[PDB]
Design a protein around this nucleic acid. Structure first.
Lengths: 321, 317
DNA sequence: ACTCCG
DNA sequence: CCGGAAG
């Protein structure tokens, strides 16, 4: 009673219930959200997509009949303390079940679909429980687990629909931060899977939406450098778009090649600084070096710093590229 | 009395005596030898180079005066009992001290300088003492210990003079298996240093000759998952790292190490080099001989990488 | 493997 | 009245 093995059965029973409810009459805008961005019902079923019904306690009552006591459901982040009996957490929202590496269901990410929705946020997730650890949790991990270790690659993307779009386009290494910013436990988790024989060898690709978001991620490459900055990479979609919207406009090939034709994390940052530079005659040419040999100076890896110093003169214009 | 700290004291005092002896009259061939390949006195002082004097027992007496019993000096591998009294191990030679990673002298490596030298062998070493362990001992480790950990790169030259050259040229990760060839306990030490950050390269540097390919047929056989992180640089023909610095310069050695071939790539393209490859009949025979090699690669992702490139290496098939 | 020159 | 290498 009220232990991991029980609570994972509740979330599994809930996943089934929410996946059942996706096919109802009132779940029309939920299915339309998916098909609007090229996600058919077979894709929705692969990622466990679901709908949260509109009533007070449509889930709580369903699980209470299946045998689950309320205190277990409260602990699993499905039901909650109400006035006239217990009530549900999620209402009138498109759901994505969030699984572990093992494929055990730990929580849900719920998207808004209605203007009269009482909940403010565009996305809301399961609260902190014994099962659901926001800071370590990642969407897509159950599917990607084997492909990231085999391939020695991981593609980090922003949202839920970005992970679906990547997986359907062949990029099965794709995962998402899921509720908050990408962080240390997420890296630690991903890094552990790519390890072989007590050595890390793979590559760590970060996809971004718009340009400044990625420039505002490359900046922080130099912040600590304890991470695998040498094995980190950046991919930015053509001016404006993100992986989901890129798939609609230009098809599954554009995603495969966005990942393929990427840039190293330090390179992207350095060249971003040269991009915003005058570079005509010697005036702005020296102003480039002035500003971004400090950037090279900050690189702690001497093998890697020597490589960027070699190429620095060429990129600004004073040497042959 | 014959303890570990006693034998360290004896060896350090011996390295001091031998270093003083290098500035003497009879040590002129040793001073020339070093300076003849661009190692000045400042370099010689950095690595602690020294001359073993000519007589029967100049060191042995010198240490006995300082306090050291003969029994300790025999355990330290410095002296040995002759019939008319104690006598030195080394005579009339250029010595390099060999140290622990901390910087403590455990033994000595000694080169022949004269045609009338007692010992005809090219290099003498200290025997298996309580400190000196041939299988784990490495010249240049004291100087590189830090830099291989920071840089995540270890460079394995052959000779004593190659370690010297590399370090003066800026390759401060260079190291050398003195006495014996490079081995298991050396790898296990260098692998350890580079862990404490995850990854780590490991570059081997041979002369421009068949020595590299023979030590290399041994690239496939064992599981050896450090073979992904192994690399092989090789200079212009005939030249060790010491000779390369004489001809070309300090920049040539840096770039030799920086322009390195991976161990599997080196092994494949070595077999490609000894093949017809001009006619279309020649390309097929090459492709036939060196897919078994790509098949011997146990790692599947690494195997497929080398298969892709194989079409290119064999003159576009 | 027991019996010439630094 | 040597120690290494000769064999």
């Amino acid at each position: 009673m009220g232990s991991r093995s029980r609570l994972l059965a509740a979330n599994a029973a809930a996943a089934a219930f929410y996946a059942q409810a996706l096919q109802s009459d009132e779940a029309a805008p939920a299915r339309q959200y998916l098909t609007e961005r090229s996600f058919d019902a077979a894709a929705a079923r692969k990622f466990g997509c679901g709908f949260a019904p509109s009533g007070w306690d449509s889930l709580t009552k369903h699980l209470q009949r299946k045998g689950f006591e309320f205190e277990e459901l409260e602990a699993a982040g499905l039901s909650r303390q109400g006035r006239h009996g217990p009530m549900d957490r999620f209402h009138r929202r498109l759901l994505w079940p969030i699984r572990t590496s093992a494929g055990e269901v730990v929580g849900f990410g719920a998207r808004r679909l209605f203007d009269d929705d009482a909940m403010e946020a565009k996305y809301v997730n399961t609260p902190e429980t014994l099962l659901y650890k926001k800071s370590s949790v990642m969407f897509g991990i159950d599917l990607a687990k084997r492909d990231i270790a085999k391939g020695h690659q991981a593609v980090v993307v922003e949202g839920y629909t970005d992970v679906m779009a990547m997986h359907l386009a062949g990029v099965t290494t794709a995962v998402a931060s899921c509720g908050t910013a990408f962080g240390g436990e997420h890296l630690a988790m991903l890094r552990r899977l790519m390890m072989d024989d007590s050595f890390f060898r793979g590559e760590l690709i970060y996809v971004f939406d718009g340009d400044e978001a990625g420039r505002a991620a490359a900046l922080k490459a130099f912040d600590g450098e304890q991470k695998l900055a040498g094995q980190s990479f950046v991919a930015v979609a053509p001016d404006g778009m993100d992986p989901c919207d890129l798939r609609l406009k230009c098809g599954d090939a554009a995603l495969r090649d966005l990942v393929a034709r990427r840039t190293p994390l330090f390179e992207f940052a350095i060249r971003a600084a040269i991009a915003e530079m005058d570079l005509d005659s010697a005036e702005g040419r020296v102003a480039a070096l002035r500003r971004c040999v400090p950037m090279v100076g900050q690189i702690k890896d001497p093998t890697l710093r020597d490589e960027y110093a070699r190429q620095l003169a060429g990129w600004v214009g004073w040497a042959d590229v």
